[PDB]
Amino acid sequence: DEIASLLQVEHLLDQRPSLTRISALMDLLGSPQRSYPSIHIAGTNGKTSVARMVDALVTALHRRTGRTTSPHLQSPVERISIDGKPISPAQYVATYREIEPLVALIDQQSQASPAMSKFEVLTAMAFAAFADAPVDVAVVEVGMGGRWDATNVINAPVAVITPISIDHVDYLGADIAGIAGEKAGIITRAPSPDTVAVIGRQVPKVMEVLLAESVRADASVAREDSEFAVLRRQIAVGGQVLQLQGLGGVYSDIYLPLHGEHQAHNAVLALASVEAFFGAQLDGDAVRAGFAAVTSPGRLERMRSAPTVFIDAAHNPAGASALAQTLAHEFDFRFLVGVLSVLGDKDVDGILAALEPVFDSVVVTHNGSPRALDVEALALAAGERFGPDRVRTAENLRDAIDVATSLVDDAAADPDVRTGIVITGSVVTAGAARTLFGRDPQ
Numbered sequence: 001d002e003i004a005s006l007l008q009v010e011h012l013l014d015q016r017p018s019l020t021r022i023s024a025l026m027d028l029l030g031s032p033q034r035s036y037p038s039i040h041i042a043g044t045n046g047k048t049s050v051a052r053m054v055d056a057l058v059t060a061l062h063r064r065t066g067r068t069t070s071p072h073l074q075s076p077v078e079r080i081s082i083d084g085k086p087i088s089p090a091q092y093v094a095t096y097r098e099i100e101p102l103v104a105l106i107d108q109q110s111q112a113s114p115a116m117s118k119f120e121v122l123t124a125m126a127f128a129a130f131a132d133a134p135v136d137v138a139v140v141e142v143g144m145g146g147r148w149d150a151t152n153v154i155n156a157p158v159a160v161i162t163p164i165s166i167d168h169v170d171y172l173g174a175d176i177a178g179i180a181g182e183k184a185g186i187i188t189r190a191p192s193p194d195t196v197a198v199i200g201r202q203v204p205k206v207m208e209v210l211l212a213e214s215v216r217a218d219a220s221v222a223r224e225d226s227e228f229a230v231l232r233r234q235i236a237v238g239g240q241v242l243q244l245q246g247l248g249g250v251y252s253d254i255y256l257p258l259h260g261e262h263q264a265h266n267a268v269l270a271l272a273s274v275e276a277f278f279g280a281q282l283d284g285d286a287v288r289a290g291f292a293a294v295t296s297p298g299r300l301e302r303m304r305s306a307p308t309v310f311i312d313a314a315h316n317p318a319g320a321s322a323l324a325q326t327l328a329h330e331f332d333f334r335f336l337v338g339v340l341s342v343l344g345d346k347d348v349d350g351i352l353a354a355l356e357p358v359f360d361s362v363v364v365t366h367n368g369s370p371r372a373l374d375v376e377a378l379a380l381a382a383g384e385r386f387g388p389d390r391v392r393t394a395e396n397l398r399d400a401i402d403v404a405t406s407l408v409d410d411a412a413a414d415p416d417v418r419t420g421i422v423i424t425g426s427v428v429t430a431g432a433a434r435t436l437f438g439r440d441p442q
């Protein structure tokens with residue numbers, strides 16, 4: 001029943017760029033998103049990961065965190081966390097009820113001379129839940145872009161920009177620098193010490209746009225590979241061991257229970273951000289404790305061994321190519337089947353090209369999202385890349401995992417051919433598969 005209420009709220013929200021509507025809303029709410037400081041995160045890849053890593057580090061320094069991330073894998077409750085944990089279905093419905101009278105008021109005034117969107121409502125809910133809790137610090141992931149994103153009403157003292165690349169596709173030719181300009185809109189002038197912008201690895205045309213917004217906000221800049229960096233990296237049971245240069249010193253023997261070189265870069269970004277936020281040297285026992293407490297559900301998360309099954313939320317070519325490098329470099333798979341479902345706004349082809357050298361075959365399917373690519377359209381795309389005989393189809397995710405399983409069975413029984421299944425292509429595919437392995441939202 002808490003659950004009935006939770007489905008009931010999801011259903012209304014699903015029946016739904018200026019900042020006018022979200023600003024008026026926050027004003028009516030009493031401006032709760034200005035009652036605590038925030039670390040605000042934009043970029044194409046790693047935003048969720050970095051947000052979780054940041055939350056873990058601030059929690060290891062003993063401040064109470066609120067964290068809003070997107071999209072969710074399994075349950076909307078995951079969008080609003082307090083102390084490192086999603087709020088409950090009851091608190092989420094309660095948070096929705098508390099703000100609804102003011103949302104209705106904004107809907108009506110706006111209609112009397114455009115209702116609020118689902119994301120605007122979710123953002124308001126997270127901000128209001130943060131003030132209700134109350135928290136010491138909020139970690140705020142951008143829904144989309146940044147300049148006109150619902151979250152962009154906070155004037156965050158730290159703004160983090162993770163690697164920028166292609167994800168949502170409107171054109172074939174890349175306006176890399178128009179994309180960068182919109183993300184950088186989360187770098188705002190401070191009201192009180194200057195805004196710090198903490199920037200991951202970018203291509204030069206991105207770098208130049210980020211730098212010039214930072215100028216316009218008179219914002220102090222910390223960029224990866226100049227002001228901080230991953231110095232050393234070593235594969236370990238469960239993850240990796242890092243030696244990191246932060247803003248305030250070298251931190252050694254950081255155990256990070258996550259796979260992938262890309263997660264080493266997210267980690268050092270999360271560190272510089274938290275140093276920027278507290279003004280860093282941070283206590284190294286706390287940095288180590290925080291990184292060891294990090295989880296990132298549905299990002300190269302191992303569901304089981306024998307056979308080994310991974311879910312990964314890779315949905316763009318840079319993500320797909322980070323997934324393939326990790327699978328090839330940090331494991332020793334003799335045989336790998338991919339289970340794949342992708343949404344129609346993605347660079348489907350660039351994903352398939354990134355994964356083809358690592359997947360012996362791929363089973364394509366439909367993840368149950370209304371925005372998913374239909375099985376036939378994906379099998380054709382996949383066929384052009386893999387060749388027709390390395391592509392199978394299945395009606396839904398559970399069938400697709402059954403087909404892949406018997407492919408790993410057949411390969412296990414084949415002496416001249418340490419096997420695995422990797423489920424990927426979308427946040428929704430990794431989230432639906434995570435629910436099938438029975439895991440709780442996290």
Ligand SMILES: Nc1ncnc2c1ncn2[C@@H]1O[C@H](COP(=O)(O)OP(=O)(O)CP(=O)(O)O)[C@@H](O)[C@H]1O
Nearest residue numbers: 044045046047048049070262299312313314319322
């Ligand atoms: N720094 C990075 N560079 C390249 N790929 C990365 C990356 N960080 C994460 N990824 C890949 O991107 C996928 C999404 O990571 P997250 O860490 O979820 O990105 P994100 O929040 O920017 C978008 P989303 O949360 O919509 O999936 C991961 O499963 C991983 O494959």
Ligand SMILES: [Co+2]
Nearest residue numbers: 047048070071
């Ligand atoms: Co995200």
Ligand SMILES: [Co+2]
Nearest residue numbers: 168169170345
């Ligand atoms: Co579009």
Ligand SMILES: [Co+2]
Nearest residue numbers: 283284285286
């Ligand atoms: Co000690």
Ligand SMILES: [Co+2]
Nearest residue numbers: 414415416417
């Ligand atoms: Co053989």
